[PDB]
Ligand binder design. Sequence first.
Ligand SMILES: CCCC(=O)Nc1nnc(S(N)(=O)=O)s1
Ligand SMILES: CCCC(=O)Nc1nnc(S(N)(=O)=O)s1
Ligand SMILES: [Zn+2]
Length: 257
Amino acid sequence: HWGYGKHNGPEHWHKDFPIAKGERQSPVDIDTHTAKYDPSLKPLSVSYDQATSLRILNNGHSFQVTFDDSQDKAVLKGGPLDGTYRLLQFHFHWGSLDGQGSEHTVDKKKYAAELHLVHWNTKYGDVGKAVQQPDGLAVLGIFLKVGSAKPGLQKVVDVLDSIKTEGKSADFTNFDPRGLLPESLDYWTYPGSLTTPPLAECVTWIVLKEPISVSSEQVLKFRKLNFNGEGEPEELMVDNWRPAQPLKNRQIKASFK
Ligand SMILES: CCCC(=O)Nc1nnc(S(N)(=O)=O)s1
Ligand SMILES: CCCC(=O)Nc1nnc(S(N)(=O)=O)s1
Ligand SMILES: [Zn+2]
């Protein structure tokens, strides 16, 4: 089964998910000098006031916080998007050290981690149907650098000891994802894919320019998670990021000058 190890990592994924060598794979390097400012791009609309978080889960490749997506409660609209996208879950990708961990890079710069808020287009009714559509998902990507703590992240970090190993989950209600957002909603956008299997080419990527700062203590708690299930040889959940993929016939657009 797929993972991030020597023998099952991103370089192996194409064997089970041949779309890994496709025409709109993610992540990519964002060359800031080649991204073109698009004045037609609308401001992003992030409406998270009524978000209902449900559970936090270790799925063996990341940890994710899941939300109630049975109603327009936490929605993403505007920006490059047509229509309304419901927040399904967020999760992170991080490194073994602070110089790696993000999936997207900015002028080849890797960040310590990358937060992905995954949303699906309500015109497709459910996420499984949306993953089959070229405009089915919108993932909001936010870079994490190490410095000052992010207070809005602390409730996440403090529960990770209860989901150390693959398959553990816990109630995680009343978490407000607005506490994970940077000040600016300036973004880059491009058509891409899921960055984990099945690597489906269904994502409008919206990557924020402004990183959030998290503390070394906060990221160290990410790195104490395990890829393995309980009772298995302990393999620390670190470096769960896919490297940048060929841009091919794609243009990255910037919402800002
Ligand atoms: C689509 C069903 C649930 C889901 O969210 N699957 C994802 N697979 N990769 C994602 S990423 N790293 O691009 O945000 S999300
Ligand atoms: C537009 C949604 C679907 C998509 O974009 N891509 C894929 N269709 N089959 C794939 S496999 N077996 O490689 O994972 S991927
Ligand atoms: Zn992700």
